[PDB]
Design a protein around this ligand. Structure first.
Ligand code: CLA
Ligand code: CLA
Ligand code: CLA
Ligand code: CLA
Ligand code: CLA
Ligand code: CLA
Ligand code: CLA
Ligand code: CLA
Ligand SMILES: CC1=C(C#C/C(C)=C/C=C/C(C)=C/C=C/C=C(C)/C=C/C=C(\C)C#CC2=C(C)C[C@@H](O)CC2(C)C)C(C)(C)C[C@H](O)C1
Ligand SMILES: CC1=C(C#C/C(C)=C/C=C/C(C)=C/C=C/C=C(C)/C=C/C=C(C)/C=C/C2=C(C)CCCC2(C)C)C(C)(C)C[C@H](O)C1
Ligand SMILES: CC1=C(C/C=C(\C)CCC[C@H](C)CCC[C@H](C)CCCC(C)C)C(=O)c2ccccc2C1=O
Lengths: 170, 69, 42, 129, 742
């Protein structure tokens, strides 16, 4: 059959709706070679980091903590490389990513969904149907935010104005 | 430096001659394929004309070298 | 982790290289922090 | 099969895939359609901030042509997936009209660019002057 | 369309299971070790694919994927050379001041006092001086900054990942069938036209659009950061026209065949650039463009899918005369069914090309400022002579493996192979006689001179002063090459190389190149070369020709390529295999290449390299002592080895103390090798018995019963440590000597 997204491209054949958010889009054929659990692991991880980054880029413009000096987020990266806070964040992410390595091994061995860490403290996933719609929304937001974060950082480079101030000006 | 010349109809003449020469001569010599209307196809035409631009380029450059042009 | 990959890491050349690289590394570190130990200091 | 006037004098169709030939021809058709209609449109009216051939290098320095190349390059990567999957395996009039107007557009565009070489002018400008 | 792509999909499963089962590839080794010999037997035969598998298809698939793995290693290595140039080097300082800063791209960590190796190479830098000539390559490329070296290192890393992916993909996912590999015409068409011709053409485009403008600006004297970036040469044709005005005409002179317009940048100057001491890059650009056309034309010779072209089998089968029976019939079948026969040819060619590369690069120095970097010139000559000698001996190793294994007499009746094997006694007896004659009349001249010089009879010597052996043919050929510009190469402006005669080229007050005169000493050492090459051929040719049978052992092919002996009978048949002639011929290769690199080192120091001074006179490194002292063995011992080992043995406490240590370490390893070469296995097995007894006494005997190494492995260990120690000692001596004095 044909891909739902691209009508004239054939369906990849490793993508038969097994993973939510599948629209049959995979022209370069990475699912014909590589494991889709690993690729969905990577898609959801990149997407969650990007979603947090876009929220951070905007909120950091709106507010910053009193103990830290006020500055733009790219300058924040460089300041906290030299200050020590960046190493703390890198270390704690690396610490969590150790048990993430264990989690990815559990996914490869079949006993875990690729983005599932059982992280539902506030019980928002009331029912299975609600979870399916929520994870479709998570996939769509994750992809959209990857595009968005690239835009903010690259535009900041080209025009040295922050995202809220760039919308505010021009 | 050997003297070459800007393109004129004599250069065109040498190219055309070598090209036709290579068509006819190749048509006989080639061992796998109405003197030119039997078994003449695109790879034979493209090969004879490639040897035609090789013989013709050599002929143009040599005749420019010696002064015949 | 896969048991066949862990069985490969248990092969003699891998363990030999890892063990003596670890051994070499703590001799190097001990001579970095405590260099030129010609004698037991006493 | 559309636009078949029995015109293959050198018989290229015998020594290259007919699907590859048709996809290449229809791509050439549509590109020259856009190029010729654009060629006349540039002289008719102009977008803000802004000849036939010199404009290529007047546009590359801004970064416009680099941008258009990047987006055509993206689409052409998906289109190379399309043509490989094509190759690895009341409307017929509309396709035939497309193919005829596209061949006409290739001739027209070739004409306009060499006329630019002749006179340093665009198509309808040459007609006006 | 009989040339077609054919692929098996998903042949081999990507599993870690066989990784955990060492020896899985052969029936003997897969049942596990019982003695320590199994361990050695595991590593020895592992890449011998045609000993594990019967089918030519699976063998071909393993070879194709192993070639991608080798390419991945080479790309990672290149990426590391570029990264170390970008990050740990003084390349930028070298670009500003080449004739003063010494290249260095390796920095050591401070651990046990070893930071003494970070010597003062110049340009505000401390590190190990590097002699691979990468800096001169990068300057010829027009790199001019460390940032572009970071992009090259990344390009190497991306290619390395793509090659290791392709090897996995083409063994485990998409493996070609045997009929794909058995397309010699298609492969040659693509490797001549596509690999070589397009490669030359693309490099010619880089030289014309990037190397030539950047290097013209550098040799004018413009600072590296003042030089425009390479793409502004590509877009703005006006600046390129300012450097070379022919670019104002574009590609109209190319297509209309008015090629003499392009003489600004496509020259035939010859000689060297006076500023850099290197080849004119306009000459190298015209050279690569000319090669590209020839290689692409060469690529249209063979027939693939449209009737035009040659059948390679028909070419071979037609060449037969009255002396040679059936002629070259049956050679096509051999060379498309035997991988070893192809490897024998390609190894002999790669080794020959590497020796030619060695000769041509010192005599016609191609890179800017490489001619006056004397450590690099000595290093790249010595390195490519050793690669050449090794690859040449591997050609005879795999000719022997072909004869023992892949040769079948039924398909080789009365052709050229059959006829060579049927007069191999006449071949080996005439070669043996040549080697005796040429050892007497080359080395005996040295022994005659030592005796006469010792006896006080200096008029009875073979020397320039006394009886003269003049190399008249080589001197005459040098005359022809000096007369050639304007005469037999009329459009040439200078000679191909100043070694033949002509001017002295000086760069940074150091000689780039100057005529290399030939005298009695040059005649003698050239016949030394002819002698050592002849006997090495005799040992390898005798091994290939007698690999299957002899008068001694009539059934040598049933014992194989590599067997130790056939017993103490028939007087003793120790070292009778073809493998043992490769074993003995690598010693004679070592002897040959050692005298070649010693001849090069002493002759260049004595008569070419040095400092130009007032009045145009040149002071050479060892002051012209080659002529009167390379005529005796005592002269080579005293005035070459003893005199020039001063720098290596006095190097302790300096940055060259590493060479001082490697000199001794290699002297040690060399001596240690003779323990394996002069001894026999039976002694070591009986000694191991008593050591096993002492382990048995303490109940600590191993379950893998220790054995002395096999007879063949004892020979291989001795040869490997002999080669390592001898070459390593020469490496340390050559490098400490030429870094100190050159
Ligand atoms: C391919 C050739 C090559 C070579 C010979 C070198 C050589 C060197 N590099 Mg360079 N390097 C290269 C490529 C290369 N590099 C590339 C491609 C990069 C880009 C990523 C770099 C980037 C780089 C940096 C950034 C630095 C070096 C440094 C060094 C030096 C010390 C390395 C060291 O001790 O670390 C040892 C590090 C270890 C972690 C020790 C690992 C030892 C393990 C045990 C080896 C085991 C292999 C394993 C068992 C194989 C089997 C796999 C397994 C599954 C069984 C040394 C001169 C250092 C230097 O120059 O300092 C001044 C340095 O800081 N290199
Ligand atoms: C134009 C076609 C072409 C080219 C370039 C090559 C190139 C090569 N082949 Mg050959 N090959 C071809 C067609 C071609 N092949 C065909 C048609 C067949 C079937 C008969 C084979 C069958 C064949 C076999 C069986 C083997 C090779 C091998 C090799 C490699 C030789 C080692 C070497 O010098 O690599 C180093 C030199 C390089 C330049 C590395 C380049 C790497 C890429 C692949 C080159 C091409 C890239 C691309 C075309 C360039 C894009 C340019 C763009 C940026 C503008 C080399 C990559 C051997 C090998 O090593 O296999 C891996 C080998 O065993 N080939
Ligand atoms: C609970 C464990 C823990 C501990 C003991 C530390 C300890 C530290 N962190 Mg880390 N940190 C942690 C968890 C922890 N962190 C976690 C979970 C995060 C989130 C990923 C961070 C993110 C972080 C950043 C971003 C920064 C630190 C900093 C610091 C330093 C504070 C200096 C100080 O005491 O004056 C201040 C005392 C207080 C704020 C009192 C409370 C100290 C090294 C800062 C620093 O100076 O780094 C060198 C810094 O900038 N940490
Ligand atoms: C009938 C036309 C014609 C004429 C007058 C010439 C004449 C010449 N050719 Mg050309 N050539 C021709 C056809 C012609 N060729 C054709 C059909 C080809 C095949 C493509 C070539 C290919 C060819 C090559 C490849 C080269 C010449 C070169 C030369 C010149 C030097 C030959 C010489 O003395 O080297 C003597 C050299 C020796 C080793 C003699 C001993 C000479 C003037 C050479 C030259 O210098 O061009 C500038 C050169 O490189 N020719
Ligand atoms: C492929 C043909 C082609 C090419 C190379 C160009 C190139 C250019 N045009 Mg011309 N133009 C075209 C078609 C083309 N145009 C068409 C069809 C029209 C009629 C609507 C115009 C009308 C036009 C005017 C009036 C002006 C330009 C201008 C320009 C320049 C700036 C880029 C721009 O704004 O594009 C404008 C192009 C369009 C509005 C239509 C483009 C057609 C398609 C949709 C774009 C293809 C890219 C596509 C997104 C990716 C491929 C997918 C495909 C399957 C659809 C550049 C010289 C301006 C300039 O700098 O002049 C000095 C200007 O004033 N063009
Ligand atoms: C694979 C190798 C390669 C590549 C990619 C290129 C690529 C290019 N060359 Mg170069 N070139 C090459 C080999 C190559 N060349 C060789 C081998 C020669 C020697 C015959 C030349 C001689 C050459 C000249 C003399 C010129 C180029 C030019 C160009 C540009 C083409 C612009 C054009 O069509 O207008 C060309 C102009 C017309 C009037 C038509 C482009 C950047 C042109 C350019 O833009 O200069 C920077 C130009 O003038 N090239
Ligand atoms: C393109 C090059 C090439 C290729 C593909 C092959 C491939 C092959 N050869 Mg040939 N060979 C080559 C070059 C090549 N050789 C050269 C240059 C020589 C001359 C020395 C030989 C001499 C030769 C002989 C004499 C024999 C082979 C054999 C073999 C086969 C078995 C390989 C194996 O399992 O070894 C496994 C690999 C090893 C055990 C590696 C250890 C080798 C040395 C000691 C290690 C290298 C030292 C290192 C560079 C420096 C150390 C640094 C130090 C300071 C610590 C295989 C078909 C053998 C056979 O029987 O085939 C039927 C065989 O007997 N070859
Ligand atoms: C210094 C050590 C040395 C010497 C002199 C020789 C000598 C020889 N080897 Mg041996 N070889 C050596 C080390 C040496 N090898 C080592 C270490 C290996 C280990 C791998 C081998 C392995 C080896 C093989 C495998 C082969 C040789 C061959 C040869 C011969 C070459 C032909 C030749 O030159 O004849 C001329 C003789 C000489 C140059 C010897 C010196 C004679 C000079 C001129 C003085 C003569 C004095 C005179 C006779 C005095 C007469 C009076 C007196 C009796 C009182 C020759 C007998 C090859 C052979 O036999 O082919 C012909 C051969 O195949 N050798
Ligand atoms: C999982 C879990 C929980 C959680 C949680 C959390 C923290 C969830 C946070 C989720 C977030 C942060 C989602 C954000 C998505 C961002 C998107 C879609 C990008 C939009 C930007 C666009 C489209 C743009 C743009 C543009 C460009 C690029 C540049 C501009 O010049 C222009 C412009 C503006 C047009 C909790 C704790 C609640 C409990 C629960 O039981 C389990
Ligand atoms: C190094 C550096 C830093 C950094 C950094 C970072 C994070 C840099 C950011 C990198 C990122 C996220 C780039 C994103 C690129 C996305 C693209 C080009 C979308 C292409 C879509 C296309 C072509 C079309 C898509 C298609 C269309 C038609 C629409 C639908 C979808 C699709 C069909 C696929 C800092 C900040 C730490 C500073 C530090 O001191 C140094
Ligand atoms: C010493 C010696 C032995 C005994 C050598 C043995 C048993 C080698 C054992 C050495 C240990 C067990 C391994 C060596 C490892 C080293 C640290 C270097 C390793 C080099 C690579 C292989 C790793 C022979 O068997 C022999 C056979 C025929 C002729 C001469 C000799 C000979 O001289």
């Amino acid at each position: 059959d044909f891909s739902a997204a691209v009508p004239f491209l054939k369906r990849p054949s490793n993508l038969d709706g097994a993973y939510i958010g599948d629209v049959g889009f995979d022209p370069l054929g990475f699912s014909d070679v590589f494991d889709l659990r690993v690729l969905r692991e990577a898609e959801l991880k990149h997407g969650r980091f990007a979603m947090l980054a876009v929220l951070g880029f905007i909120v950091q413009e709106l507010y910053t903590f009193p103990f830290f000096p006020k500055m733009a987020p790219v300058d924040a990266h460089d300041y906290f490389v030299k200050q020590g806070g960046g190493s703390q964040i890198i270390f704690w992410i690396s610490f969590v990513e150790l048990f993430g390595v264990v989690a990815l091994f559990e996914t490869l061995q079949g006993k875990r969904e690729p983005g599932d860490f059982a992280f539902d403290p506030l019980g928002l996933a009331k029912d299975e149907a609600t979870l399916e719609r929520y994870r479709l929304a998570e996939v769509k937001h994750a992809r959209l935010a990857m595009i968005a974060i690239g835009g903010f950082i690259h535009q900041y480079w080209v025009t040295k104005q922050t995202v809220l101030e760039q919308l505010g000006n021009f | 430096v050997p003297q070459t010349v800007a393109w004129s109809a004599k250069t065109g003449a040498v190219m055309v001659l070598s090209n036709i020469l290579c068509i006819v001569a190749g048509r006989y010599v080639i061992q796998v394929k109405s003197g030119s209307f039997a078994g003449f196809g695109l790879p034979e035409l493209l090969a004879s004309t490639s040897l035609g631009h090789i013989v013709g380029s050599g002929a143009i450059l040599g005749l420019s070298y010696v002064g015949v042009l | 982790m896969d048991s066949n990959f862990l069985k490969y890491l248990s092969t003699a050349p891998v363990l030999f290289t890892v063990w003596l690289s670890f051994t070499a590394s703590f001799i190097i570190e001990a001579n970095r922090f405590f260099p030129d130990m010609l004698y037991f200091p006493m | 099969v559309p636009g078949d006037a029995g015109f293959d004098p050198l018989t290229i169709s015998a020594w290259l895939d007919s699907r590859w030939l048709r996809e290449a021809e229809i791509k050439h058709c549509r590109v020259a359609m856009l190029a010729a209609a654009g060629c006349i449109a540039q002289d008719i009216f102009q977008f803000p901030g802004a000849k036939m051939t010199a404009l290529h290098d007047a546009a590359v320095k801004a970064g416009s042509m680099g941008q258009m190349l990047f987006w055509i390059g993206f689409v052409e990567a998906i289109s190379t997936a399309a043509t490989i999957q094509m190759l690895q395996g009341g409307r017929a009039r509309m396709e035939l009209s497309e193919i005829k107007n596209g061949r006409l557009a290739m001739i027209g565009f070739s004409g306009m660019v060499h006329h630019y070489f002749i006179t340093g002018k665009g198509p309808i400008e040459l007609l006006t002057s | 369309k009989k040339v077609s792509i054919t692929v098996d999909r998903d042949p081999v499963a990507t599993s870690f299971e066989k990784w955990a089962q060492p020896g899985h590839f052969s029936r003997t080794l897969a049942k596990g070790p019982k003695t320590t010999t199994w361990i050695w037997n595991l590593h020895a035969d592992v890449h011998d694919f045609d000993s594990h598998t019967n089918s030519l298809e699976d063998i071909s698939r393993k070879i194709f994927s192993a070639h991608f793995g080798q390419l991945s290693i080479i790309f990672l290595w290149l990426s590391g050379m570029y990264f170390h140039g970008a990050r740990f080097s003084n390349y930028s300082a070298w670009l500003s001041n080449p004739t003063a800063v010494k290249p260095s791209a390796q920095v050591v960590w401070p651990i046990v006092g070893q930071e003494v190796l970070n010597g003062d190479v110049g340009g505000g830098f401390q590190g190990v001086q590097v002699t691979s000539g990468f800096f001169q390559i990068w300057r010829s490329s027009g790199i001019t900054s460390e940032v572009e070296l970071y992009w090259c290192a990344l390009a190497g890393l991306i290619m390395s990942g793509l090659m290791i992916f392709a090897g996995w993909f083409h063994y485990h996912k998409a493996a070609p069938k045997l009929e794909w590999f058995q397309n010699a015409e298609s492969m040659l068409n693509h490797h001549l036209s596509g690999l070589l011709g397009l490669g030359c053409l693309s490099w010619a485009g880089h030289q014309i659009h990037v190397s030539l403008p950047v290097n013209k600006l550098l040799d004018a004297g413009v600072a590296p950061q003042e030089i425009p970036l390479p793409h502004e040469f590509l877009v703005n044709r006006d600046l390129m026209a300012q450097l070379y005005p022919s670019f104002s005409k574009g590609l109209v002179p190319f297509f209309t065949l008015n090629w003499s317009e392009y003489s600004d940048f496509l020259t035939f100057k010859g000689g060297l650039n006076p500023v850099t001491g290197g080849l004119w890059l306009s000459d190298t650009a015209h050279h690569h463009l000319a090669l590209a056309v020839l290689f692409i034309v060469a690529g249209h010779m063979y027939r693939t899918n449209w009737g035009i072209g040659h059948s390679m089998k028909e070419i071979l089968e037609a060449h037969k005369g009255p002396f040679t029976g059936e002629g070259h019939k049956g050679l096509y079948e051999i060379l498309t069914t035997s991988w070893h026969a192809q490897l024998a040819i390609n190894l002999a060619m790669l080794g020959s090309v590497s020796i030619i590369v060695a000769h041509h690069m010192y005599a016609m120095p191609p890179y800017p400022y490489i001619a006056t970097d004397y450590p690099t010139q000595l290093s790249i000559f010595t390195h490519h002579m050793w690669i050449g000698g090794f690859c040449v001996c591997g050609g005879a190793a795999h000719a022997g493996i072909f004869m023992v294994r892949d040769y079948n007499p039924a398909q080789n009746y009365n052709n050229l192979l059959d006829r060579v094997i049927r007069h191999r006694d006449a071949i080996i007896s005439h070669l043996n006689w040549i080697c005796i004659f040429l050892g007497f009349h080359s080395f005996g001249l040295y022994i005659h001179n030592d005796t006469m010089r010792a006896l006080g009879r200096t008029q009875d010597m073979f020397s320039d002063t006394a009886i003269q052996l003049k190399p008249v043919f080589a001197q005459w050929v040098q005359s022809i090459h000096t007369l050639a510009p304007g005469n037999t190469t009329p459009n040439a402006l200078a000679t191909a190389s100043y070694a033949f005669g002509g001017d002295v080229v000086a760069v940074g007050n150091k000689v780039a190149m100057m005529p290399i005169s030939l005298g009695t000493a040059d005649f003698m050492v050239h016949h030394i070369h002819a002698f050592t090459i002849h006997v090495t051929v005799l040992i390898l040719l005798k091994g290939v020709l007698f690999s299957r049978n002899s008068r001694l052992i009539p059934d040598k092919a049933n014992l194989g390529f590599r067997f130790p002996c056939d017993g103490p009978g028939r007087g003793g048949t120790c070292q009778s295999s073809a493998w043992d002639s490769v074993f003995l011929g690598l010693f004679w290769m070592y002897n040959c290449i050692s005298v070649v690199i010693f001849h090069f080192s002493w002759k260049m120091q004595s008569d070419v390299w040095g400092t130009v001074q007032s009045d145009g006179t040149v002071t050479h490194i060892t002051g012209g002592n080659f002529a009167q002292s390379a005529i005796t063995i005592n002269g080579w011992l005293r005035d070459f080895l003893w005199a020039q080992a001063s720098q290596v043995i006095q190097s302790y406490g300096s940055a060259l103390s590493a060479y001082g240590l490697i000199f001794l370490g290699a002297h040690f390893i060399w001596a240690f090798s003779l323990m394996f070469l002069f001894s026999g296995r039976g002694y070591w097995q009986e000694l191991i018995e008593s050591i096993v007894w002492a382990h048995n006494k303490l109940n600590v005997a191993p379950a893998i019963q220790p054995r002395a190494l096999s007879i063949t492995q004892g020979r291989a260990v001795g040869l490997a440590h002999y080669l390592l120690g001898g070459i390593g000692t020469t490496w340390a001596f050559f490098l400490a000597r030429i870094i100190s004095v050159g």
